[PDB]
Subunit: 298 residues, 4 copies
C-alpha cells in the first residue's frame, strides 16, 4: 500500500488524514511534537474504519523514524515574526523527514506558503518538481463555491484557475473559469463577479472572523487531500499549486502559484497562460510581494 | 425512497439500472415486453447488492402497473423512415402506457432518433415540456472530453465541454465552449488536431458499432443517462446539453434540439442561450435543418 | 432534498455534518448557541464542496427557526452534576427544536446518553420509536476495530452486537460477533478476547487520556452519521441503539442500548436475543445503573 | 498504477472491467480472441470516464503481449465431459500464453467448471498455489445473503455468510456460519424457510438462466470477481470463500475446493479450517466426491 505521512496533527492535518483514510488511498502516519495528540487522533480515526469501511492503517507518532519510505509527505505544522517561527518549524520538519523518504513528493501547507515551500525545497534538496505547496486549490475552491451559489448551478460543473498566493498576493483570473465549458462571465455580470473575486481574496479571513479563535480546516484539508490523491493515483490533475519557476511568466528562482499538471512525478508540467496586460499587472505585483517575503527568509 | 422506472431492459437500460442501484438513488423497476428478461436482469442486479452494498429494491416486470408513481421514467426500448416508424410505434406504446401512471415524473428519452422520439414522447404524454427531455448531448460531450483529456495529457475530471444538436451529422460541436480547469481547450490542442477530435466525436457512435460489429455502445450511453437521472432526483442543477423543446431559442421553434440547460428537480429549469458566432450559427442551422426533416417525417 | 439539523456545532456535530454532506444525504443545518461558530464551520464545509463534489446546502445558525421541517435532528450539544448541566441543555434544545420538526427522528448523542434520550422523549412527546440515542454503534465499532486488528482481517468482514450504555454500563456480547459469518471466538482465544472486551469498555477513556484536553469525535461522528443515513435511506440496519423498552429483556419504562432494525420510521423493530445467564447478569447490572441515573433525572 | 488483465471480453469480463475502472483500482486490459470486440468494449467504457470520474487506462486487445506484467489476471473466457473438454482447451490456451508474461500475478479463474478449471490453471501456469484461485463462493454467498436479508427485513450490508464446495449440487451450505450484525441467522429465519433459501441458493445460477432463456447471470458474478480483485490489489485481507488448493484441509488432498480463506496481496494467505459437525461433514464429503469426479475427468 502507499504510505502518506502528515507532519502536524492539528485541525488541517487530522482532517486531511480523515479524507485520505476514507478513500483508502494508503496507510497514514500522523506525526506531531506533542505526545499523545497524534496517537489519540489516529486511534479515533482508525476506530471509525468498520463504520466507513476502509482498510488502511492509521497510526500516530512522535518519532520521525515511523515516517520512513513515505510516498507523500504533507506538512501542516505551521503556527515578519511569522516568517521566523514558521521557518524554524519547517526546517526542523523537513530536515528530519526528507532523508527518511528520499522518493517522496512533499506538499507544504504551512504559511507563508510560497516561502515555506521554497524553504522545504532548499532543506530537502529534492528535485523541484517533487516539492510543492497547497494554496491555489483552496482559493479556487472558494471562488467555485461562490460562483456555483450565485449562478444556481452544481459545484460539479464550475471550474476555475488562479495564481499567486493567498489574500493580497492572490492573482484572480475570472477569465479562466467556466461552467460546463461556458465562460463564467456569461452567467455572472461584472460587478457581481468583482464582488465574488474580492470575497475569494478575503476568504480565509472571513472564516477566521466567524470562528473567532480558529481558522478554516475543512476546505484546506480537502484541497490538500485532492493534491495527495493526484500524486498517489497519477491523475494528472490541472490545478494551481505553488511550484518552482524557471522562467515561466517571466519569473525565476521563486515558488509561485501557477497552473500545473500534477501527477506521480509531482509537477509534470507548468502551464503558461496567455495573460493580458491587466492580469500580468496583478501577477507582477504579487510576485513582488512574494519576492519580498523570500528575501526576508534569506 | 425515490422510484425510477426504466422501459426497455436491453444493454443501455440494464446498465443504467446498475449505476442507479449502486448509488442507491432509489427503487428501480425494469420493464420490458419480453417475459423473463427484465425479471432475470433485475434479480441478477439485486443479488449483487450484498457485495456492492446498496439497499434499494430492484425488480423486473412486464406490467406497466408496476411503474406507477415513478419520479423518473427512462425510455431505452428503441430498435430512415422505417427506423423512425418502428421507433415511433415503440415510443408511443411505451409512453401512452407509462405516462398516465406517473403524472409527476420527468421523462428521459434515449431511443433513436433521439430528438424526434423525445418530441413524440412530449406529445403522447401531454406533460409540461420541461419534464420531457432526451439524452444525447451528455454522451457526445463525454466522448469529446475523453479524447481531449487523452490528447492534452490531463485528468478527465478537469475537462468540461458543451455542444448542441443531435448525434452524428446533426451534432453541433462547440470547441470554443470547452475548458480544462477553466482554461480554453484551444490553448492545449492545435487546430488541426482539434478538428480531428471533433470529427471523431461526430462519428463516435459508429466507431463503436464498427468494432463490436453486432452491437452498439451502452456503457457511456448508460452513464450519461444515469447522470441526468441523478441530476433530477438530487436536484443538482447540472449544466448540461440535453434535448429540450425550443420556442425561440437559437431561432428554433416547435422542435426538440440539443441545447445547454440547467437540469434539476423540475426537469429543464432553464434553457441557456449562448452567444454563437457566425461559423457556429452556420453549423447549428444546418443541424436544425436535419432535425426538422426527421421531425417532419415523424409528423407524416 | 432531505433536511438534517445538527444541534451543537462542536467536534462531533461538525464532523457528523462533514460525513453527511460528503455523502449528499441532504441539506445540513448546523445550530449553536455561540454566534459565528456554526456559521464559520458551515461555510468552511460548504467551500469544500467543489473539491469533494457534493451538492447540498450547509448552513450555520443561532436561530432554531432555521431547523424547521427537518427529517432528522441530531443533538450533540452536551457538556451527579453532569446530569444536571446536560439535562437543562437537552430540555432547551428539544423544547425549541421538536415543535418545528414534528415528523423528525431525533438522534441523541449527549451524555449521559440513555438518560438524555429518555428526557428528549419526554420533552418532544414524539412517538418513542422516533427518539433514539447513539452509543452502541460507536462501542461496537471500537470492538470491531480491535477484533479486525488482532485477527488480521478486513474491518469490512467483522460484525458485532452489544448492549447497555458506555463504560461500566456497556454489556459486551462477544458471542454475538462474527467474521464473515464465522464466530469471532474461532479466531481469538478467550484471554485475548477478554482483553479486547475490556479495551472496548474503556475505549472512550483511552482517547481522552491520549488527547489530554479533548474527547473522541471521528468515530462518534461516524457512528451518528451511519444512524442518520439508516433513517434517511430507510436501510433497515441492524445496530445497537438506545431505545425505549416496553418489556424486552424484562425491562420497562427506560431507554437502554438494544439491537434494533433502524429505518425511516426510526426503531422499526427491537430484537430479542436469547441471552444466557452470564450475559443476563451483565445486562441486569447495567440496567440497574441506567435506572439509577434515570431516577436522579426524575 | 496497478495493472489488471481480463481474459474474455464477454458479459462477466466487461462488467468486471467496468467496476474495477469506476473504482480506479488500476489500468485495465481486456483481451479476447475475437477481433474488435474487446477494443469496442474498452473504448465504450473509457468514454464513460469523464462522467463517472475515473482516471485509469482501459484498452482492448487481441494480443497477449499487452497483458505483460499484470498484478492480477482474471479469466472469464469459458463457454458434461464435452463442457469440461471445451473449457479445458480454452483455459489451457489462455493460461499458457498469459502466465509467462505476468509471473508475479495472482490468477483469478471464473470459467466453469470452476474448481476444475482453477486446478488446470494452477498446472499450466506452475504458479504457487496461493496465487491461483477461483471465484464461486463469493457469488453463492451473495445470493444467500440477498435472500436472507429480504426475508429478515434487514440491510444487505449487515448479512454475512460462509459456504464451501462448488456451484449447484457441489455447494456446501453452512447456515450455522451466517450472521446478521453478529446475530445467528437461525434466530431470524425459521428452519423450513431457511431450508428453502438454501435450496434457492443451490439453484441460483439456473434460476437466472431460466428467466433470461438465452443467457446467464453476470452482474453478481462480476461483482464477486471484482471484490476478489480488490482484495488482492488493496491487500484488504478479506475473509471469503474461494476455490483454493487443499493439502489436507477438511480431509481433502490435491484438489481445488471452495473454502474459507483470508485473501490479500499474496493471494490466499490462509485457509481457514472450520469445526464442522457431522451433518455438515456429510454435505462436504458428498460435494468433494462430485468435485473429485470432475477433476478425474479433466485428468483423463
Ligand atoms: N488555505 C491555506 O493555505 C491554509 C488554511 C489553513 C491553515 N494553513 C496553515 O496550515 C498550518 C496548520 O494549520 P492548523 O490550523 O491545522 O494548525 P494547528 O495549530 O491546529 O496544528 C499544527 C500542529 O503542528 C504541530 N507542530 C508544531 N511544530 C511541530 C514540529 N516541529 N513537528 C511536528 N508537529 C509540529 C502542533 O503541535 C500542532 O498539533 C498553519 O501553518 C496554517 O497557517 C493554510
Ligand atoms: N447515445 C445515444 O443517443 C444512444 C446510445 C445507446 C442507445 N441508444 C438507443 O437506445 C435504444 C436502446 O438501445 P439498446 O442498445 O439498449 O437496445 P437493446 O436492443 O439491447 O434493448 C432494447 C430493449 O427494449 C425492449 N423493447 C422493445 N419494445 C418495447 C416496448 N414496446 N416496451 C418495452 N420494452 C420494449 C426489447 O425487448 C429490448 O430488451 C435504441 O433505440 C438505440 O438506438 C441511443
Ligand atoms: N461515543 C459517545 O457516546 C460520545 C462520544 C463523544 C462525545 N459524546 C457527547 O456528545 C456531546 C458533544 O461532544 P463534543 O465533543 O462535540 O462537544 P463540544 O463541546 O465540542 O461541542 C458542543 C457544542 O454544543 C454547543 N452548545 C451548548 N449548549 C447549547 C444549546 N443550548 N444549544 C445549541 N448548542 C449548544 C456548544 O456551544 C458547543 O459548540 C457531549 O455531550 C459529549 O459528552 C458522546
Ligand atoms: N458464478 C459463476 O461461477 C459464474 C458466473 C458467470 C459466468 N461463469 C463462467 O464464466 C465464463 C464466461 O461467462 P460469460 O457469460 O462472460 O460468457 P461470454 O460467452 O459472454 O464471454 C466469454 C468471452 O470469452 C471469449 N473467449 C473464448 N475463448 C477465448 C480464448 N481462448 N481467449 C480469449 N478470449 C476467449 C469469447 O470470445 C467471449 O467474448 C463461462 O465459462 C461461464 O460458465 C461462472
Ligand atoms: Cl510567501
Ligand atoms: Cl444513562
Ligand atoms: Na472530518
Ligand atoms: Na455495468
Amino acid at each position: 500500500r502507499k504510505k502518506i505521512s502528515i507532519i502536524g496533527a492539528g485541525f488541517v492535518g487530522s482532517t486531511t488524514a480523515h479524507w485520505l483514510a476514507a478513500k483508502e488511498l494508503g496507510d497514514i502516519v500522523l506525526l506531531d511534537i506533542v505526545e499523545g495528540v497524534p496517537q489519540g487522533k489516529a486511534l479515533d480515526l482508525y476506530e471509525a474504519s468498520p463504520i466507513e469501511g476502509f482498510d488502511v492503517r492509521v497510526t500516530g507518532t512522535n518519532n520521525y523514524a515511523d515516517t520512513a519510505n513515505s510516498d507523500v509527505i504533507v506538512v501542516t505544522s505551521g503556527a515578519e515574526d511569522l516568517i521566523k517561527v514558521n521557518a524554524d518549524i519547517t526546517r526542523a520538519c523537513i530536515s528530519q523527514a526528507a532523508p527518511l523518504s528520499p522518493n517522496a513528493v512533499i506538499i507544504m501547507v504551512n504559511n507563508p506558503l510560497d516561502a515555506m515551500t521554497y524553504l522545504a525545497a532548499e532543506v530537502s534538496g529534492f528535485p523541484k518538481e517533487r516539492v510543492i505547496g497547497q494554496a491555489g486549490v483552496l482559493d479556487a475552491a472558494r471562488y467555485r463555491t461562490f460562483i456555483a451559489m450565485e449562478a444556481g448551478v452544481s459545484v460539479e460543473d464550475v471550474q476555475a484557475m488562479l495564481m499567486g498566493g493567498h489574500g493580497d498576493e492572490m492573482v484572480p483570473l475570472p477569465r479562466f473559469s467556466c461552467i460546463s465549458g461556458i465562460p463564467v462571465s456569461e452567467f455572472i455580470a461584472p460587478d457581481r463577479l468583482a464582488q465574488i473575486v474580492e470575497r475569494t481574496r478575503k476568504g480565509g479571513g472571513e472564516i477566521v472572523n466567524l470562528l473567532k479563535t480558529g481558522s478554516a480546516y475543512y476546505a484546506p484539508a480537502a484541497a490538500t487531500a485532492q493534491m495527495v490523491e493526484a500524486v498517489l493515483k497519477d491523475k494528472k490533475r490541472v490545478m494551481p499549486v505553488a511550484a518552482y519557476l524557471t522562467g515561466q511568466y517571466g519569473l525565476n528562482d521563486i515558488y509561485f502559484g501557477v497552473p500545473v499538471i500534477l501527477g506521480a512525478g509531482g509537477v509534470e508540467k507548468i502551464l503558461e497562460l496567455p495573460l493580458n496586460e491587466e492580469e500580468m499587472a496583478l501577477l507582477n505585483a504579487s510576485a513582488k510581494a512574494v519576492r519580498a517575503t523570500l528575501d526576508t527568509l534569506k
